[PDB]
Design a protein around this ligand. Structure first.
Ligand SMILES: [Co+2]
Ligand SMILES: [Co+2]
Ligand SMILES: [Co+2]
Ligand SMILES: [Co+2]
Ligand SMILES: [Co+2]
Ligand SMILES: [Co+2]
Lengths: 251, 251, 251, 251, 251, 251
């Protein structure tokens, strides 16, 4: 139950990711064999729930690609449920300040370090109590990644970076650019400046910066600035754009 | 992506609806061909979730009947998820005051007009970014309908009617009659008086009144008073009552 | 595990049925409480399979209405699977002659009386071996109903009626009328004469006649003539027609 | 719609239960025939939602074993949805004080006794309005069981026990032991003392004590102290441990 | 219910297709908007059944792309079920001779032209009897495409082409090359010669030639030679290859 | 894609199995971690289909336990579909003679060795063409196990054993005992003698004998006699019996 994604971030090894919004355990398996370091199962902007996350985790399990799950909100109940089906790395949207970052961390840890509810007999996470000393080992293998995606969050970044347990800070360019008045097109200089400055500042604190960006030149630029978990495409986009291009070539 | 239901309300064209509680994409398609102007996919009182709403929207799509979705609560996260799978007209239950009405409206609009989270690459709503300028066009095609269904809500109706974005106000007779002490039988004069007075007052403000009522004589009465979205039956009731009547005719 | 539908046929008590083509465990429960003697889960003309049959059987189980299942064909393998999930009354389509009727019967019976495969530990049918002596008790509680639906089958009816274990013979007016050259018009005199004559011949042979007909006056005629399992409507039709009529009353 | 589990608790008849975390309507039916007085469908620590609770309720319905449902949190919206699909006995986790206990009770009662939303036409709970006077009969057949599972909750137990509507108080040893510093192993004397003292105090108030414990000797000890709803095993554990033992016997 | 794909073939307008093996109603909708003339829902080599075909048909329905369905075999019972859920264009695998081609045709036609079972009240195909005179109109809108995939089938092609109701003949290069002794290598000259010769012979007979080929230059060659329904890619391949290429660009 | 189960049989290493009839990807994972050498996904006597087989294969994949799949019949089309979703070891029921054994083998092999249909781009089996030279490597990793379950099959055993590609012969005691006139009583001496003699004859022929038996002492006897794939229990039974025993210990 060692979290290899978390260890890679701590070691400063960049992790290249693909976003999964197709909400299918079948396409998840297909994509798990494609060579990515990590895969993001999106519970916020794709039609997923705890049950479909579970089946996508099962599909991905035998592959080297490591699963990361985004809940629909920073909700301790939903987080509890996602952890019990076996989620170990969480990307929490709309984290606005250090209190919310601490709340996210706490939701993933058993008492006394947090408020995670105990149900190990029932949980895939413990392999239904086959993992010895699961309750004592689980906290240290949780990896908490918080999203900053408003001006307010950017303003609070220094305090967020002081939060123990926050392993990574992810910048969401679509939401950020919308909040900045450039809906939701992040290519503007003002947005790019905020993004790049945040990446530097995050890495400086010893935490992992992350981002999703479909422009490959920008992705390489962010990696050069020290980003450590960079998602470089989205399954729905890859499929749609490839299919459209193919159809157009035949008139 | 023009919202034809919203345009019809704004033009003062009454829209006759059927409530869908069978929670099936198959019966939804069957009913989408029955001649109604709108269909209510009930996420509050039928066993639906974001995923079953999605499949019912797909089933209904090629028909003239327009889908409306009721979330289980005025919850901005659930609303975000329903909008991304393509919901454009929302019926929000238990809206008690103008602050809650504003919250409902805000949940459906991208910044700066609201707090809707941005995820268009992943969303059926944008057809996975095939709709050009989706982010700039979406806000104006959202139709927000708020339910008033307690004495408190009735008391706050004048302020609710002053809320920009609130396109329609729906009176829920079952909940209202229960709150008034007539569980949950709305046929009482006191309940009927509150309902009819609200319909007049709503229409007077330039907003659309709505209601669900299975009594067809009452439905016509509400239409005559100026109601513009009137659901006149419920799928589960139509099926159950027709089947029971049939069985009884054969002993 | 007594088959009460079968006992009722044997005692000459007419059983009034409803056809289920909505393929949903949810609407199946709703309809199971409507007062019918039997409900037909249609695996031939509705999108059902062994798994959805199972869930509909579970939904119907606590109600007095008895389930009957129609497989897609007289296929011993499919019949084996349906029986193991708990089907005890089968309506077999397109039975053309006595050999095929015999094969339908043999598919439902364990050796030496038939060729039913043994898997009792796994089967809902035996309640996972909780029913004592299931293997010795099962054969006698199977009820086999065969459909005669062509001119060839009508010719062979006397031989079909002589087959031991054929408990009932069902006339399919839609298929029969199509085979006779009157598609969509079983109301034609030559078709009605064939149907009436078959019903009388079936009953005079000491077996149960059955039919589906949505015209309530014809249903009553068939009951008078001695039909013992008569389906008097179809869920999809009841729902579609009630909905369409409702919408039409409002324009 | 009489709640027989609730009546048994009120009569002081101990009820022996099994926990269901397999989240399957198929295994639920299999286990419903095993002889337990009650079955716990776990929406907090197993991958269930309103829809899978519904199908497990349908599967269990014809058996003598009575269903109890645990929502993922004390959330009035989720409770509303669970009640409409037919839940009558609720086990509410993490109830910390008397205000939260009152909130749980209120969520299950129609006005004026509570805030339960009215949707009986659509609800399996009313059998789609077949149950006469459902709205007037429902409140009295709801059975509310609250979980105490922290030191804080134990401290507030006397006030919780004064709450009308609270029919039972369940002690959760896994969460309690974790909160007490013995994650999450409850066998410690300190934990056992808190548990046994609570059982006595609960029963003394005229309310039903409950607990889940897989150690059968402890279960008998709790029953001897006056516990009235005792779950004595968990489906996932029974299956896993039996399978592991079997494999080990063959090397 | 006009079959526009069939009318296009008859008019000699080439139709460009994409193969759907992702077996998801969600990705089917995404791809239905990509601009293809037709989409092949594969029931032979992807994990589909009648029920998933149904949901994909519903997803595709509002788009201009026309659905074609491949059953797992030339099986009249399976074909009956696919037609009733609304399939009008069928691609039948492993058609070896004229007798088998005739049987494929007869499976799609109501008596006296064929053996299609009648169940219109239940069928999406008739929109549950909403389409007037469905039974008299259906036969003419069925489009039957037969696959020639072996040396034996190539031999029998002239007789297959003489079968009335065979609208198109599709060459399966993967199966054909395997049968010829070049598995996985349809690029071999002897295979290409067989394919080209078949396409010309099919077209000269006044029928539509079809093929699937992922090599875009070969596709263009086949179109030049007169192929009228040409699938130019496969969803699983498009997705897998785009993802793998992306991951490789970042290491 | 090496078949380790097949290699183990060939090397004479006995493989201990558990039967899976719960038809759930969730319980399949739970059981995949219990330490068995193989797990039988039963498509004959449990409510499975190609799609649920797929999800169980995905669940089992990261564990050391090897999956074996039983189709509902010796049906080449069904076998094609099971192989494409990734099945490499097949247990074929009711194989009565050498011709049928040959047909089972041929269904699993690409031409010229067999009649397996080619669809590698679409198949999980080839990991969507990621496995290089899949088409040339697949045949050799198929493992075909045939069931002898009647007196006729026992007669033909010597000829069945002479069929190339038959890797193992499994004796089905429930079906065999029923065919011999001892339904539900394979413990009878004449049945045990037939079983023992078959096991010895199979092994002496250089092939693997198999059987399912829930009596652990008989299992050990069969292993001593040289059986190489022995299933020693069934998930539904393990669960039902453990639950019933538990409930009985409390009254
Ligand atoms: Co964002
Ligand atoms: Co209401
Ligand atoms: Co028929
Ligand atoms: Co707890
Ligand atoms: Co082919
Ligand atoms: Co057998």
């Amino acid at each position: 139950m060692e979290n290899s994604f978390k260890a890679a971030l701590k070691a400063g090894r960049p992790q290249i990711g693909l976003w999964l919004g197709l909400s299918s355990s079948y396409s998840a398996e297909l994509l798990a064999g494609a060579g990515f370091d990590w895969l993001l199962i999106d519970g916020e902007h794709a039609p997923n729930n705890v049950q479909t996350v579970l089946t996508q985790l099962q599909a991905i399990a035998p592959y080297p690609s490591q699963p990361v799950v985004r809940p629909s909100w920073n909700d301790p109940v939903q987080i509890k449920q996602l952890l019990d089906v076996g989620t170990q790395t969480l990307l929490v949207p709309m984290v606005q300040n250090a209190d919310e970052a601490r709340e996210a961390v706490r939701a993933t840890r058993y008492p006394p370090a947090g408020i995670r509810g105990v149900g190990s007999a029932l949980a895939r996470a413990s392999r239904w109590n086959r993992i010895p000393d699961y309750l004592q080992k689980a906290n240290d293998q949780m990896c908490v990644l918080v999203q900053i995606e408003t001006r307010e969050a950017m303003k609070n970044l220094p305090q967020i970076l002081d939060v123990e347990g926050v392993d990574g800070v992810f910048i969401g360019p679509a939401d950020l650019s919308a909040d900045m008045g450039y809906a939701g097109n992040p290519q503007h200089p003002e947005v790019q400046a905020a993004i790049e400055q945040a990446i530097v500042q995050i890495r400086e604190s010893g935490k992992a910066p992350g981002i999703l960006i479909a422009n490959e030149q920008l992705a390489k630029r962010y990696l050069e600035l020290g980003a450590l978990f960079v998602a470089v495409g989205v399954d729905t986009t890859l499929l749609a754009r490839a299919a459209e291009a193919l159809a157009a070539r035949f008139g």
